[PDB]
Amino acid sequence: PRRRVIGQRKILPDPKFGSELLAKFVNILMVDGKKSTAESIVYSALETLAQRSGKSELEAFEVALENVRPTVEVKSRRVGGSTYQVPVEVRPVRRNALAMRWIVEAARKRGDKSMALRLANELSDAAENKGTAVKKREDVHRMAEANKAFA
Amino acid sequence: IKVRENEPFDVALRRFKRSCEKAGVLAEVRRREFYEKPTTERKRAKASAVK
Amino acid sequence: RKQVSDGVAHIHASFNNTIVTITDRQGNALGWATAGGSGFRGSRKSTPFAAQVAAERCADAVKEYGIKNLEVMVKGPGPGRESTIRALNAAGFRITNITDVTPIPHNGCRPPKKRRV
RNA sequence: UUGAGCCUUGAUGUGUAGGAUAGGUGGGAGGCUUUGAAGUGUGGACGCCAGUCUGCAUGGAGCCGACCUUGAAAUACCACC
RNA sequence: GGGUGAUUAGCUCAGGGGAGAGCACCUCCCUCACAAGGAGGGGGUCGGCGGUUCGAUCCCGUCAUCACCCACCA
RNA sequence: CGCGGGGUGGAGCAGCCUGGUAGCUCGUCGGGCUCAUAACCCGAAGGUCGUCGGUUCAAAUCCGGCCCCCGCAACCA
RNA sequence: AAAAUGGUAA
RNA sequence: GCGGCCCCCUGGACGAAGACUGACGCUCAGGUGCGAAAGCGUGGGGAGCAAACAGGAUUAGAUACCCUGGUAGUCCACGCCGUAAACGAUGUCGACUUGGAGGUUGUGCCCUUGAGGCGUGGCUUCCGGAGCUAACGCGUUAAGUCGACCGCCUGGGGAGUACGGCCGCAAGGUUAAAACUCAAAUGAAUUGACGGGGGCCCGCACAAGCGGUGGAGCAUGUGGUUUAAUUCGAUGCAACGCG
Ligand SMILES: [Mg+2]
Ligand SMILES: [Mg+2]
Ligand SMILES: [Mg+2]
Ligand SMILES: [Mg+2]
Ligand SMILES: [Mg+2]
Ligand SMILES: [Mg+2]
Ligand SMILES: [Mg+2]
Ligand SMILES: [Mg+2]
Ligand SMILES: [Mg+2]
Ligand SMILES: [Mg+2]
Ligand SMILES: [Mg+2]
Ligand SMILES: [Mg+2]
Ligand SMILES: [Mg+2]
Ligand SMILES: [Mg+2]
Ligand SMILES: [Mg+2]
Ligand SMILES: [Mg+2]
Ligand SMILES: [Mg+2]
Ligand SMILES: [Mg+2]
């Protein structure tokens, strides 16, 4: 980072649906290098979501993300010897990266029986934009709005 | 300072301030400078202004 | 009320705060607003964004007088100054003149001693 | 000049079931109309923005009203306010 | 004893169809640490009793309490 | 000699009418931060309530003795 | 924003 | 030391040409005068600023730096004080010794044939030659080569202090020692190291992330304590599942 601007590592798409975005999602959910366990959880959650709201696996999942993608965030700058919180726009790829991360943390905290059930409920609430992950996005937007003076 | 702008306008044109005192005088007339500080800042100002 | 239809906007920009006062053409005030009074007290009120928000509020609270035109008189330095003028233009006012009235002594009274921070 | 007023007249009046800017109560089953109603702008005010009390103007012979509702039912007219 | 006024979150105070502010407590970030900031969660029969309309913190009388003026004060 | 006020953790001070569960600064102890020490941060421990005797189911708190300390008064000759 | 100190000889 | 504009009184410097006096000159102990700011006395004045002082912060503390106020003073008239890094840290006068680039102010001639060409004075700034200098540097405005006169110095501390004299309203100024004590104190420059100095660059250094330790039980090492012995060594990073 100091010197060498670097490239990007490619990931293969999801076997069931052939989408890169969903493949990244299982990676975020994976723990201890157990991809088969992770993909099993995600597929079960997606199927439950699809039959809950009709719609379809990818479209329902995308709708949930759109309600959690951030648009601006604060970042300490410390230029003149004082600490500020300057809002900054979010890069398009970093948007869903934060969205997917936030959803997983919300699901992990949610107290249901199975992880698939936790995940299905969490991003189902996200589709109706009332879950904890949605609350996280609102706080980030609200904090950035307050510090709009700096730019 | 004084600009009597005509009806075609989208730019402030506030450029006579930099052509005038504007903030140079304000920045220097806000704290007293004991006579000998000026003389010294004047002397070094153009001691450096040599090529 | 009284439909003056044109006045003057006085911008008092300093290093710590900015005050916007809209008067008629005889110096009778009609309305005012300040960066400090628009929230964001402290270090956030000496910013250009602080100044334009104050200008927008001062544009409000005088709409009853139906101002259409106004000169702007700018006083002092500060992070505001230019930001307010843009906000007044964006607020829907026909700016006619732009003059600065910053007081410049012909070196009269002695200023305070230099800060030794 | 300004209020306190003072003694008269015009307006004044949103949860909610509803045509809704239902102020309470009664005489109360009919009115004003050239002592201008209808179709339109006008401005103070307001508002949980329903448009209203309001000045006149092209205008020139009509509808309200019980009815569906509401805890309340006609400001149809009059009156104790 | 008569008159004048009052009782509303832990605190300081607003308000015939809506209990409102500000300060407190816990969290969130924030900060070197803080601090200073911004964001959420709360926390009241609106003192009780009784009284009209549909209720009416709003309206009325009685209590318990507080403040002042006055009577009382032999 | 007479009259008042005090005695509470290691130090200086609150808790008295309100007899039914000793708190607050600095100190002390353990762990952090530092090359190390101060400062700073986190977490703990520390109390015959001067002594003795009573009335109370219960006494730092209410009463009456004793010890110590502080402050007033001790005048007319 | 704040930021003190470092026993004797060798 | 002296900055708005105008008037009144007044000192010095420089240039052109000519006339005049005829060594009338240079330096100067003692002496006399002038001498920033602060300060003192008497009488005025007082906007701003601001010692002292008061409050708010910061801090371990903060008799400070920062913030809010604020008296003397800063201003005027007269009198005193007589000191400054009063510095060019370089006494005054005179003569001589290669150059370059500028500023300011006079003056002669040539077609001014625009802001030009050729000369000749005064003051002033920078860079550099020989020479000088411990070096740094100075260098026709010398710290170069010489002459005249004056002032001053003789290791550091004690000490520009004590005592005495003179001066002052005071504050104090000026002249100016000794005992005692040390073997150094000091100037310029060189190489490093360091800086809460500057520039450029790099590192799981930060930032972006993931998973841990610090809490529990147990394994293991160390410190401490204990013991007859608890063998010896390793001790910030770079000792502590180490020999
Ligand atoms: Mg200031
Ligand atoms: Mg002499
Ligand atoms: Mg003086
Ligand atoms: Mg004086
Ligand atoms: Mg005086
Ligand atoms: Mg000050
Ligand atoms: Mg001297
Ligand atoms: Mg000098
Ligand atoms: Mg000298
Ligand atoms: Mg030279
Ligand atoms: Mg002396
Ligand atoms: Mg003497
Ligand atoms: Mg990191
Ligand atoms: Mg452990
Ligand atoms: Mg061993
Ligand atoms: Mg050893
Ligand atoms: Mg060894
Ligand atoms: Mg190892």
Swiss-Prot record, chain A:
GO terms classed as biological process: cytoplasmic translation; negative regulation of translation; ribosomal small subunit assembly; translation
Further details from the record: The strain K12 sequence is shown. Has been predicted to contact the N-terminal domain of IF-3 based on footprint studies; exactly how IF-3 interacts with the 30S subunit is controversial.
Keyword Transport among record annotations: no
Record function comment: One of the primary rRNA binding proteins, it binds directly to 16S rRNA where it nucleates assembly of the head domain of the 30S subunit. Is located at the subunit interface close to the decoding center, where it has been shown to contact mRNA. Has been shown to contact tRNA in both the P and E sites; it probably blocks exit of the E site tRNA. Protein S7 is also a translational repressor protein; it regulates the expression of the str operon members to different degrees by binding to its mRNA.
Record keywords, A-Z: Ribonucleoprotein, Ribosomal protein, RNA-binding, rRNA-binding, tRNA-binding
Family the entry assigns: Belongs to the universal ribosomal protein uS7 family.
Name of the protein described by the UniProt record: Small ribosomal subunit protein uS7
Gene name linked to the record: rpsG
Consequence the record notes for mutating residue 35 to A/E: Defective in ribosome assembly
GO molecular function: mRNA binding; rRNA binding; structural constituent of ribosome; tRNA binding
Subunit structure: Part of the 30S ribosomal subunit. Contacts proteins S9 and S11. Cross-links to IF3 and the P and E site tRNAs.
CC per GO annotation: cytoplasm; cytosol; cytosolic small ribosomal subunit; membrane; ribosome
Superkingdom of origin organism: Bacteria
Range covered out of full length: 2 to 152 of 179
From Swiss-Prot, chain C:
InterPro entries per record: Ribosomal_uS11, Ribosomal_uS11_bac-type, Ribosomal_uS11_CS, Ribosomal_uS11_sf
Keywords: Ribonucleoprotein, Ribosomal protein, RNA-binding, rRNA-binding
GO cellular-component term (any): ribonucleoprotein complex
GO biological process, one term: translation
Annotated S-S bridges: none
GO molecular function terms listed in the Swiss-Prot or TrEMBL record: rRNA binding; structural constituent of ribosome
Keyword match rRNA-binding: yes
Entries under Gene3D superfamilies matching the protein: Ribosomal protein S11 (3.30.420.80)
Pfam families for the chain: Ribosomal_S11
Domain of life: Bacteria
NCBIfam families documented for this protein: PRK05309.1, uS11_bact
Purpose of the protein: Located on the platform of the 30S subunit, it bridges several disparate RNA helices of the 16S rRNA. Forms part of the Shine-Dalgarno cleft in the 70S ribosome.
Known partners and oligomeric status: Part of the 30S ribosomal subunit. Interacts with proteins S7 and S18. Binds to IF-3.
Similarity comment: family membership: Belongs to the universal ribosomal protein uS11 family.
Name of this chain's protein: Small ribosomal subunit protein uS11
Organism, as annotated: Escherichia coli O45:K1 (strain S88 / ExPEC)
